[PDB]
JSON list of C-alpha atoms in Angstrom, two decimals:
[
{"chain": "A", "resi": 19, "resn": "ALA", "atom": "CA", "xyz": [-24.32, -54.47, -16.45]},
{"chain": "A", "resi": 20, "resn": "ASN", "atom": "CA", "xyz": [-23.09, -51.06, -17.16]},
{"chain": "A", "resi": 21, "resn": "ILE", "atom": "CA", "xyz": [-19.24, -51.04, -16.47]},
{"chain": "A", "resi": 22, "resn": "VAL", "atom": "CA", "xyz": [-18.13, -47.98, -14.77]},
{"chain": "A", "resi": 23, "resn": "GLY", "atom": "CA", "xyz": [-14.74, -47.34, -13.14]},
{"chain": "A", "resi": 24, "resn": "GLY", "atom": "CA", "xyz": [-15.17, -47.59, -9.32]},
{"chain": "A", "resi": 25, "resn": "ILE", "atom": "CA", "xyz": [-18.18, -49.91, -8.92]},
{"chain": "A", "resi": 26, "resn": "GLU", "atom": "CA", "xyz": [-18.03, -53.17, -6.75]},
{"chain": "A", "resi": 27, "resn": "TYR", "atom": "CA", "xyz": [-17.61, -56.82, -8.23]},
{"chain": "A", "resi": 28, "resn": "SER", "atom": "CA", "xyz": [-17.18, -60.03, -6.34]},
{"chain": "A", "resi": 29, "resn": "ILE", "atom": "CA", "xyz": [-14.73, -62.90, -7.05]},
{"chain": "A", "resi": 30, "resn": "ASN", "atom": "CA", "xyz": [-15.88, -66.44, -6.83]},
{"chain": "A", "resi": 31, "resn": "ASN", "atom": "CA", "xyz": [-18.64, -65.09, -4.59]},
{"chain": "A", "resi": 32, "resn": "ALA", "atom": "CA", "xyz": [-16.16, -64.17, -1.94]},
{"chain": "A", "resi": 33, "resn": "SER", "atom": "CA", "xyz": [-13.87, -61.07, -2.08]},
{"chain": "A", "resi": 34, "resn": "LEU", "atom": "CA", "xyz": [-14.88, -57.68, -3.25]},
{"chain": "A", "resi": 35, "resn": "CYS", "atom": "CA", "xyz": [-12.89, -55.41, -5.44]},
{"chain": "A", "resi": 36, "resn": "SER", "atom": "CA", "xyz": [-13.56, -52.24, -7.46]},
{"chain": "A", "resi": 37, "resn": "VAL", "atom": "CA", "xyz": [-13.71, -52.03, -11.25]},
{"chain": "A", "resi": 38, "resn": "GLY", "atom": "CA", "xyz": [-10.50, -50.01, -12.76]},
{"chain": "A", "resi": 39, "resn": "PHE", "atom": "CA", "xyz": [-11.37, -49.27, -16.34]},
{"chain": "A", "resi": 40, "resn": "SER", "atom": "CA", "xyz": [-13.54, -50.40, -19.37]},
{"chain": "A", "resi": 41, "resn": "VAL", "atom": "CA", "xyz": [-11.17, -51.59, -22.22]},
{"chain": "A", "resi": 42, "resn": "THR", "atom": "CA", "xyz": [-11.34, -53.68, -25.14]},
{"chain": "A", "resi": 43, "resn": "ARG", "atom": "CA", "xyz": [-9.20, -56.41, -26.94]},
{"chain": "A", "resi": 44, "resn": "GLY", "atom": "CA", "xyz": [-10.09, -56.63, -30.48]},
{"chain": "A", "resi": 45, "resn": "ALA", "atom": "CA", "xyz": [-13.81, -57.63, -30.32]},
{"chain": "A", "resi": 46, "resn": "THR", "atom": "CA", "xyz": [-13.43, -58.66, -26.53]},
{"chain": "A", "resi": 47, "resn": "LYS", "atom": "CA", "xyz": [-14.81, -56.39, -23.70]},
{"chain": "A", "resi": 48, "resn": "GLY", "atom": "CA", "xyz": [-13.02, -56.24, -20.47]},
{"chain": "A", "resi": 49, "resn": "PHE", "atom": "CA", "xyz": [-12.11, -54.19, -17.42]},
{"chain": "A", "resi": 50, "resn": "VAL", "atom": "CA", "xyz": [-8.66, -53.76, -15.90]},
{"chain": "A", "resi": 51, "resn": "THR", "atom": "CA", "xyz": [-8.27, -54.14, -12.15]},
{"chain": "A", "resi": 52, "resn": "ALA", "atom": "CA", "xyz": [-5.84, -55.34, -9.47]},
{"chain": "A", "resi": 53, "resn": "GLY", "atom": "CA", "xyz": [-3.92, -58.60, -9.78]},
{"chain": "A", "resi": 54, "resn": "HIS", "atom": "CA", "xyz": [-4.38, -59.42, -6.15]},
{"chain": "A", "resi": 55, "resn": "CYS", "atom": "CA", "xyz": [-8.22, -59.47, -6.65]},
{"chain": "A", "resi": 56, "resn": "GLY", "atom": "CA", "xyz": [-8.52, -62.91, -8.36]},
{"chain": "A", "resi": 57, "resn": "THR", "atom": "CA", "xyz": [-6.73, -65.81, -10.03]},
{"chain": "A", "resi": 58, "resn": "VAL", "atom": "CA", "xyz": [-7.00, -66.64, -13.69]},
{"chain": "A", "resi": 59, "resn": "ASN", "atom": "CA", "xyz": [-10.40, -67.94, -14.50]},
{"chain": "A", "resi": 60, "resn": "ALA", "atom": "CA", "xyz": [-11.97, -66.61, -11.18]},
{"chain": "A", "resi": 61, "resn": "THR", "atom": "CA", "xyz": [-15.37, -65.41, -11.78]},
{"chain": "A", "resi": 62, "resn": "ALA", "atom": "CA", "xyz": [-16.69, -61.79, -11.47]},
{"chain": "A", "resi": 63, "resn": "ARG", "atom": "CA", "xyz": [-20.02, -60.99, -10.58]},
{"chain": "A", "resi": 64, "resn": "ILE", "atom": "CA", "xyz": [-21.79, -57.65, -10.66]},
{"chain": "A", "resi": 65, "resn": "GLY", "atom": "CA", "xyz": [-24.85, -57.12, -8.79]},
{"chain": "A", "resi": 66, "resn": "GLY", "atom": "CA", "xyz": [-25.18, -60.97, -8.21]},
{"chain": "A", "resi": 67, "resn": "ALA", "atom": "CA", "xyz": [-24.74, -61.59, -11.90]},
{"chain": "A", "resi": 68, "resn": "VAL", "atom": "CA", "xyz": [-21.68, -63.15, -13.67]},
{"chain": "A", "resi": 69, "resn": "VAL", "atom": "CA", "xyz": [-20.11, -60.60, -16.03]},
{"chain": "A", "resi": 70, "resn": "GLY", "atom": "CA", "xyz": [-16.94, -62.31, -16.97]},
{"chain": "A", "resi": 71, "resn": "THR", "atom": "CA", "xyz": [-13.77, -64.07, -15.57]},
{"chain": "A", "resi": 72, "resn": "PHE", "atom": "CA", "xyz": [-10.25, -63.25, -15.02]},
{"chain": "A", "resi": 73, "resn": "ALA", "atom": "CA", "xyz": [-8.23, -63.53, -18.15]},
{"chain": "A", "resi": 74, "resn": "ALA", "atom": "CA", "xyz": [-4.77, -62.78, -16.81]},
{"chain": "A", "resi": 75, "resn": "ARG", "atom": "CA", "xyz": [-3.00, -61.28, -14.11]},
{"chain": "A", "resi": 76, "resn": "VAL", "atom": "CA", "xyz": [0.33, -60.75, -12.20]},
{"chain": "A", "resi": 77, "resn": "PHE", "atom": "CA", "xyz": [0.50, -60.55, -8.44]},
{"chain": "A", "resi": 78, "resn": "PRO", "atom": "CA", "xyz": [2.88, -60.15, -6.59]},
{"chain": "A", "resi": 79, "resn": "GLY", "atom": "CA", "xyz": [5.94, -58.60, -8.47]},
{"chain": "A", "resi": 80, "resn": "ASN", "atom": "CA", "xyz": [3.24, -56.21, -10.13]},
{"chain": "A", "resi": 81, "resn": "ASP", "atom": "CA", "xyz": [-0.46, -55.93, -9.24]},
{"chain": "A", "resi": 82, "resn": "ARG", "atom": "CA", "xyz": [-2.67, -56.09, -12.36]},
{"chain": "A", "resi": 83, "resn": "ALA", "atom": "CA", "xyz": [-5.16, -58.01, -13.97]},
{"chain": "A", "resi": 84, "resn": "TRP", "atom": "CA", "xyz": [-8.05, -57.78, -16.78]},
{"chain": "A", "resi": 85, "resn": "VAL", "atom": "CA", "xyz": [-11.41, -59.67, -16.77]},
{"chain": "A", "resi": 86, "resn": "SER", "atom": "CA", "xyz": [-12.86, -60.71, -20.21]},
{"chain": "A", "resi": 87, "resn": "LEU", "atom": "CA", "xyz": [-16.61, -59.85, -20.16]},
{"chain": "A", "resi": 88, "resn": "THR", "atom": "CA", "xyz": [-19.42, -61.52, -21.77]},
{"chain": "A", "resi": 89, "resn": "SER", "atom": "CA", "xyz": [-20.95, -59.58, -24.94]},
{"chain": "A", "resi": 90, "resn": "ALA", "atom": "CA", "xyz": [-23.95, -58.42, -22.90]},
{"chain": "A", "resi": 91, "resn": "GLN", "atom": "CA", "xyz": [-21.88, -56.02, -20.74]},
{"chain": "A", "resi": 92, "resn": "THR", "atom": "CA", "xyz": [-21.96, -52.21, -21.74]},
{"chain": "A", "resi": 93, "resn": "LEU", "atom": "CA", "xyz": [-18.58, -50.71, -21.57]},
{"chain": "A", "resi": 94, "resn": "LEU", "atom": "CA", "xyz": [-18.67, -46.97, -20.65]},
{"chain": "A", "resi": 95, "resn": "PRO", "atom": "CA", "xyz": [-15.80, -44.40, -20.59]},
{"chain": "A", "resi": 96, "resn": "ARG", "atom": "CA", "xyz": [-16.82, -43.16, -17.13]},
{"chain": "A", "resi": 97, "resn": "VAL", "atom": "CA", "xyz": [-15.72, -43.42, -13.46]},
{"chain": "A", "resi": 98, "resn": "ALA", "atom": "CA", "xyz": [-18.17, -43.18, -10.63]},
{"chain": "A", "resi": 99, "resn": "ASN", "atom": "CA", "xyz": [-17.96, -39.95, -8.53]},
{"chain": "A", "resi": 100, "resn": "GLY", "atom": "CA", "xyz": [-21.17, -40.27, -6.10]},
{"chain": "A", "resi": 101, "resn": "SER", "atom": "CA", "xyz": [-24.04, -39.96, -8.34]},
{"chain": "A", "resi": 102, "resn": "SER", "atom": "CA", "xyz": [-22.12, -38.28, -11.07]},
{"chain": "A", "resi": 103, "resn": "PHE", "atom": "CA", "xyz": [-19.45, -39.45, -13.51]},
{"chain": "A", "resi": 104, "resn": "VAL", "atom": "CA", "xyz": [-15.92, -38.51, -14.64]},
{"chain": "A", "resi": 105, "resn": "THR", "atom": "CA", "xyz": [-15.32, -39.07, -18.17]},
{"chain": "A", "resi": 106, "resn": "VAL", "atom": "CA", "xyz": [-12.18, -41.06, -19.25]},
{"chain": "A", "resi": 107, "resn": "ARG", "atom": "CA", "xyz": [-10.43, -38.93, -21.86]},
{"chain": "A", "resi": 108, "resn": "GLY", "atom": "CA", "xyz": [-7.12, -40.78, -22.25]},
{"chain": "A", "resi": 109, "resn": "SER", "atom": "CA", "xyz": [-4.17, -42.25, -20.27]},
{"chain": "A", "resi": 110, "resn": "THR", "atom": "CA", "xyz": [-1.47, -39.33, -20.13]},
{"chain": "A", "resi": 111, "resn": "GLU", "atom": "CA", "xyz": [0.50, -40.10, -17.16]},
{"chain": "A", "resi": 112, "resn": "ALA", "atom": "CA", "xyz": [0.74, -37.32, -14.56]},
{"chain": "A", "resi": 113, "resn": "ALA", "atom": "CA", "xyz": [3.87, -36.24, -12.83]},
{"chain": "A", "resi": 114, "resn": "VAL", "atom": "CA", "xyz": [4.73, -35.97, -9.16]},
{"chain": "A", "resi": 115, "resn": "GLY", "atom": "CA", "xyz": [2.85, -33.24, -7.49]},
{"chain": "A", "resi": 116, "resn": "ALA", "atom": "CA", "xyz": [-0.31, -33.57, -9.83]},
{"chain": "A", "resi": 117, "resn": "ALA", "atom": "CA", "xyz": [-3.78, -33.57, -8.38]},
{"chain": "A", "resi": 118, "resn": "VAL", "atom": "CA", "xyz": [-5.53, -37.06, -8.53]},
{"chain": "A", "resi": 119, "resn": "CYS", "atom": "CA", "xyz": [-8.52, -38.73, -7.39]},
{"chain": "A", "resi": 120, "resn": "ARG", "atom": "CA", "xyz": [-9.46, -42.45, -7.13]},
{"chain": "A", "resi": 121, "resn": "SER", "atom": "CA", "xyz": [-12.97, -44.28, -6.95]},
{"chain": "A", "resi": 122, "resn": "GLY", "atom": "CA", "xyz": [-13.84, -47.47, -5.14]},
{"chain": "A", "resi": 123, "resn": "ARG", "atom": "CA", "xyz": [-16.65, -49.38, -3.54]},
{"chain": "A", "resi": 124, "resn": "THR", "atom": "CA", "xyz": [-15.36, -48.67, 0.08]},
{"chain": "A", "resi": 125, "resn": "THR", "atom": "CA", "xyz": [-14.57, -44.97, 0.41]},
{"chain": "A", "resi": 126, "resn": "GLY", "atom": "CA", "xyz": [-16.01, -43.67, -2.83]},
{"chain": "A", "resi": 127, "resn": "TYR", "atom": "CA", "xyz": [-14.30, -40.84, -4.64]},
{"chain": "A", "resi": 128, "resn": "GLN", "atom": "CA", "xyz": [-11.40, -39.35, -2.77]},
{"chain": "A", "resi": 129, "resn": "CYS", "atom": "CA", "xyz": [-8.55, -36.94, -4.10]},
{"chain": "A", "resi": 130, "resn": "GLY", "atom": "CA", "xyz": [-5.08, -35.98, -3.33]},
{"chain": "A", "resi": 131, "resn": "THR", "atom": "CA", "xyz": [-1.73, -35.72, -4.93]},
{"chain": "A", "resi": 132, "resn": "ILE", "atom": "CA", "xyz": [0.84, -37.81, -6.41]},
{"chain": "A", "resi": 133, "resn": "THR", "atom": "CA", "xyz": [3.69, -37.93, -3.97]},
{"chain": "A", "resi": 134, "resn": "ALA", "atom": "CA", "xyz": [6.17, -40.40, -5.35]},
{"chain": "A", "resi": 135, "resn": "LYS", "atom": "CA", "xyz": [6.63, -43.04, -8.21]},
{"chain": "A", "resi": 136, "resn": "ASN", "atom": "CA", "xyz": [8.32, -46.27, -8.37]},
{"chain": "A", "resi": 137, "resn": "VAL", "atom": "CA", "xyz": [7.47, -47.30, -4.85]},
{"chain": "A", "resi": 138, "resn": "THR", "atom": "CA", "xyz": [7.99, -50.90, -3.59]},
{"chain": "A", "resi": 139, "resn": "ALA", "atom": "CA", "xyz": [4.85, -52.29, -1.22]},
{"chain": "A", "resi": 140, "resn": "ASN", "atom": "CA", "xyz": [5.88, -55.35, 0.77]},
{"chain": "A", "resi": 141, "resn": "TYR", "atom": "CA", "xyz": [2.57, -57.29, 1.06]},
{"chain": "A", "resi": 142, "resn": "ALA", "atom": "CA", "xyz": [2.08, -60.78, 2.89]},
{"chain": "A", "resi": 143, "resn": "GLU", "atom": "CA", "xyz": [2.69, -62.55, -0.63]},
{"chain": "A", "resi": 144, "resn": "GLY", "atom": "CA", "xyz": [5.73, -60.92, -1.78]},
{"chain": "A", "resi": 145, "resn": "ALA", "atom": "CA", "xyz": [7.01, -57.28, -2.88]},
{"chain": "A", "resi": 146, "resn": "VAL", "atom": "CA", "xyz": [5.29, -55.22, -5.50]},
{"chain": "A", "resi": 147, "resn": "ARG", "atom": "CA", "xyz": [7.43, -52.84, -7.43]},
{"chain": "A", "resi": 148, "resn": "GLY", "atom": "CA", "xyz": [6.99, -49.61, -9.30]},
{"chain": "A", "resi": 149, "resn": "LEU", "atom": "CA", "xyz": [4.02, -48.29, -7.79]},
{"chain": "A", "resi": 150, "resn": "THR", "atom": "CA", "xyz": [3.03, -44.51, -7.74]},
{"chain": "A", "resi": 151, "resn": "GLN", "atom": "CA", "xyz": [2.12, -43.22, -4.34]},
{"chain": "A", "resi": 152, "resn": "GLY", "atom": "CA", "xyz": [-0.61, -40.64, -3.77]},
{"chain": "A", "resi": 153, "resn": "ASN", "atom": "CA", "xyz": [-2.25, -39.27, -0.51]},
{"chain": "A", "resi": 154, "resn": "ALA", "atom": "CA", "xyz": [-5.88, -39.65, -1.40]},
{"chain": "A", "resi": 155, "resn": "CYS", "atom": "CA", "xyz": [-7.30, -42.02, 1.24]},
{"chain": "A", "resi": 156, "resn": "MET", "atom": "CA", "xyz": [-8.73, -45.63, 0.46]},
{"chain": "A", "resi": 157, "resn": "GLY", "atom": "CA", "xyz": [-10.02, -48.63, 2.44]},
{"chain": "A", "resi": 158, "resn": "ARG", "atom": "CA", "xyz": [-10.26, -52.45, 2.06]},
{"chain": "A", "resi": 159, "resn": "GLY", "atom": "CA", "xyz": [-12.30, -53.19, -1.07]},
{"chain": "A", "resi": 160, "resn": "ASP", "atom": "CA", "xyz": [-11.06, -50.04, -2.88]},
{"chain": "A", "resi": 161, "resn": "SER", "atom": "CA", "xyz": [-8.28, -52.27, -4.53]},
{"chain": "A", "resi": 162, "resn": "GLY", "atom": "CA", "xyz": [-8.59, -52.36, -8.45]},
{"chain": "A", "resi": 163, "resn": "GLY", "atom": "CA", "xyz": [-10.45, -49.23, -8.64]},
{"chain": "A", "resi": 164, "resn": "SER", "atom": "CA", "xyz": [-9.56, -46.16, -10.86]},
{"chain": "A", "resi": 165, "resn": "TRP", "atom": "CA", "xyz": [-6.96, -43.53, -10.35]},
{"chain": "A", "resi": 166, "resn": "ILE", "atom": "CA", "xyz": [-7.66, -40.45, -12.52]},
{"chain": "A", "resi": 167, "resn": "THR", "atom": "CA", "xyz": [-7.16, -36.91, -12.88]},
{"chain": "A", "resi": 168, "resn": "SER", "atom": "CA", "xyz": [-10.18, -34.57, -12.72]},
{"chain": "A", "resi": 169, "resn": "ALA", "atom": "CA", "xyz": [-9.47, -33.88, -16.47]},
{"chain": "A", "resi": 170, "resn": "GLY", "atom": "CA", "xyz": [-10.13, -37.49, -17.33]},
{"chain": "A", "resi": 171, "resn": "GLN", "atom": "CA", "xyz": [-6.68, -38.78, -17.58]},
{"chain": "A", "resi": 172, "resn": "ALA", "atom": "CA", "xyz": [-6.67, -42.59, -16.31]},
{"chain": "A", "resi": 173, "resn": "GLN", "atom": "CA", "xyz": [-3.58, -43.29, -14.07]},
{"chain": "A", "resi": 174, "resn": "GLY", "atom": "CA", "xyz": [-3.86, -46.61, -12.93]},
{"chain": "A", "resi": 175, "resn": "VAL", "atom": "CA", "xyz": [-5.67, -49.21, -10.60]},
{"chain": "A", "resi": 176, "resn": "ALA", "atom": "CA", "xyz": [-5.42, -49.21, -6.87]},
{"chain": "A", "resi": 177, "resn": "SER", "atom": "CA", "xyz": [-3.32, -51.58, -5.21]},
{"chain": "A", "resi": 178, "resn": "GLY", "atom": "CA", "xyz": [-2.73, -50.92, -1.49]},
{"chain": "A", "resi": 179, "resn": "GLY", "atom": "CA", "xyz": [-1.90, -48.43, 1.24]},
{"chain": "A", "resi": 180, "resn": "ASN", "atom": "CA", "xyz": [-1.63, -48.10, 4.90]},
{"chain": "A", "resi": 181, "resn": "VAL", "atom": "CA", "xyz": [-5.08, -48.85, 6.14]},
{"chain": "A", "resi": 182, "resn": "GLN", "atom": "CA", "xyz": [-5.44, -48.45, 9.91]},
{"chain": "A", "resi": 183, "resn": "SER", "atom": "CA", "xyz": [-7.59, -50.65, 12.09]},
{"chain": "A", "resi": 184, "resn": "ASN", "atom": "CA", "xyz": [-11.00, -49.05, 10.80]},
{"chain": "A", "resi": 185, "resn": "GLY", "atom": "CA", "xyz": [-10.04, -50.53, 7.41]},
{"chain": "A", "resi": 186, "resn": "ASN", "atom": "CA", "xyz": [-8.97, -47.34, 5.74]},
{"chain": "A", "resi": 187, "resn": "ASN", "atom": "CA", "xyz": [-6.38, -44.47, 5.89]},
{"chain": "A", "resi": 188, "resn": "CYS", "atom": "CA", "xyz": [-8.99, -41.60, 5.69]},
{"chain": "A", "resi": 189, "resn": "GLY", "atom": "CA", "xyz": [-8.87, -41.12, 9.61]},
{"chain": "A", "resi": 190, "resn": "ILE", "atom": "CA", "xyz": [-5.25, -39.92, 9.29]},
{"chain": "A", "resi": 191, "resn": "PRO", "atom": "CA", "xyz": [-3.67, -36.88, 7.73]},
{"chain": "A", "resi": 192, "resn": "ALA", "atom": "CA", "xyz": [-2.98, -36.72, 4.23]},
{"chain": "A", "resi": 193, "resn": "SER", "atom": "CA", "xyz": [0.64, -35.94, 5.10]},
{"chain": "A", "resi": 194, "resn": "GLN", "atom": "CA", "xyz": [0.75, -39.53, 6.67]},
{"chain": "A", "resi": 195, "resn": "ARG", "atom": "CA", "xyz": [-1.12, -41.51, 3.87]},
{"chain": "A", "resi": 196, "resn": "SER", "atom": "CA", "xyz": [0.49, -43.83, 1.47]},
{"chain": "A", "resi": 197, "resn": "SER", "atom": "CA", "xyz": [-1.96, -45.16, -0.98]},
{"chain": "A", "resi": 198, "resn": "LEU", "atom": "CA", "xyz": [-0.42, -47.01, -4.05]},
{"chain": "A", "resi": 199, "resn": "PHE", "atom": "CA", "xyz": [-1.66, -47.73, -7.53]},
{"chain": "A", "resi": 200, "resn": "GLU", "atom": "CA", "xyz": [-0.30, -49.91, -10.50]},
{"chain": "A", "resi": 201, "resn": "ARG", "atom": "CA", "xyz": [0.40, -47.50, -13.52]},
{"chain": "A", "resi": 202, "resn": "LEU", "atom": "CA", "xyz": [-2.10, -48.13, -16.21]},
{"chain": "A", "resi": 203, "resn": "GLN", "atom": "CA", "xyz": [0.48, -47.87, -19.31]},
{"chain": "A", "resi": 204, "resn": "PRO", "atom": "CA", "xyz": [2.26, -51.03, -18.73]},
{"chain": "A", "resi": 205, "resn": "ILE", "atom": "CA", "xyz": [-0.90, -52.95, -18.26]},
{"chain": "A", "resi": 206, "resn": "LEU", "atom": "CA", "xyz": [-2.42, -51.86, -21.58]},
{"chain": "A", "resi": 207, "resn": "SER", "atom": "CA", "xyz": [0.75, -52.80, -23.52]},
{"chain": "A", "resi": 208, "resn": "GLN", "atom": "CA", "xyz": [1.19, -56.19, -21.68]},
{"chain": "A", "resi": 209, "resn": "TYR", "atom": "CA", "xyz": [-2.21, -57.26, -22.65]},
{"chain": "A", "resi": 210, "resn": "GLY", "atom": "CA", "xyz": [-2.94, -55.48, -25.86]},
{"chain": "A", "resi": 211, "resn": "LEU", "atom": "CA", "xyz": [-5.84, -53.42, -24.33]},
{"chain": "A", "resi": 212, "resn": "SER", "atom": "CA", "xyz": [-7.28, -50.25, -25.68]},
{"chain": "A", "resi": 213, "resn": "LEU", "atom": "CA", "xyz": [-9.00, -47.92, -23.15]},
{"chain": "A", "resi": 214, "resn": "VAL", "atom": "CA", "xyz": [-12.64, -46.94, -23.74]},
{"chain": "A", "resi": 215, "resn": "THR", "atom": "CA", "xyz": [-12.58, -43.21, -23.83]},
{"chain": "A", "resi": 216, "resn": "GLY", "atom": "CA", "xyz": [-15.41, -40.44, -24.57]}
]
């Protein structure tokens, strides 16, 4: 399968999550995603085919993971934006007030601004600290997806937000949205990953 930020993948033929970013580990191909999406060795499928398994993860505390893929997967430096793509150019971290977008299988590509850093989310399983908050909306299934600037600087992977009864926070004003992502930098160093760029 072609690995692009934002697409859907399933975990052990049950839950759905979104691909964060294509990365490598020495000769190993992978993608980073959210830790809550699977447990170590869970099986990831893209369009019904097995593409790899979870190699490591941390959730709760943090919310990160990387899936090691088979050799047949094609890694691309891109993030889905409808029918188009956003090229990943690096991982410079944007500051509070910067504009940012996120891509995922449930709400597609949404943009907003970063509103705060170092936020704590209290999930049913435990607290997750050090999250960056933005006001782009997201929905259930968007978790693990890419957060990136329009300029191509990858920021992190979708963790959670104040989704309403309709499954998203897109029906409430930006001023009221809290959509959190796990910072990419610490994920790449913790696992020794290199981002695929173009």
